[PDB]
Amino acid sequence: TTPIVHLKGDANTLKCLRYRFKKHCTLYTAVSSTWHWTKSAIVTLTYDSEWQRDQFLSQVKIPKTITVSTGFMS
Amino acid sequence: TTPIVHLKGDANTLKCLRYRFKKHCTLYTAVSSTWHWTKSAIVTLTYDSEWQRDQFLSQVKIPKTITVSTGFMS
């Protein structure tokens, strides 16, 4: 239903990314606060479509030290 | 790849659920800290398979006030 992305890594790095993502606020529906399994930190992003998700990923520069995983929700 | 679930609602309710979930720790791979879009609160759970996800949902009692959504990650 809804395409999602998980960005996993350094909490500080994720905080910087969320800051940078504000420059492309129309490229995603929502971005979460930083969470963890309870270790690395994780941020979840939701999108309006697979196209928007790819437009977002094609425009934002994500460090190689951050793991990008894609998925879908209902 | 990996089946996931999002439990959305009252942070206090989610905290109680995480406490109760510890009684069925083998029914899930991991459960997250409570996060939010940045409003309701959300907890993410990951599983080893669709079967485990259903075994988990068939055993835990989740309040009707909590929205349960399913999805998958890579």
Residue B32's beta-bridge partner residues? Answer: A37
For residue A45, the tally of other CB atoms under 10 A from its CB is 25
- What is the resolution in angstroms? 1.8
Q: Closest CB to A73: pick one of B2, B6, B34.
A: B6
Contact A35 B32 (CB under 8 A): yes
Contact B42 A31 (CB under 8 A): no
Contact B32 A37 (CB under 8 A): yes
Domain containing residue A54: CATH number:
3.30.70.330
Q: Which domain holds residue B39?
A: 1-74
B39–chain A nearest CA distance, Å: 11
Exp. method: X-ray
CA B68 → CA A3, A12, A73, B4, distances in Å? 17, 30, 11, 11
Nearest to B21 by CA among B72, B68, B71, B62: B62
Backbone gaps in chain B, preceding residues (C–N over 2.5 A): 38
Whose tokens are 């209902």? That residue is A74
Contact A72 B72 (CB under 8 A): yes
In the structure encoding, which two tokens stand for residue B71, read together? 């999805």
Task: Give the count of domains, chain B.
Answer: 1
CB proximity under 8 Å: B 12-51 to A: 30-38, 42, 44, 46
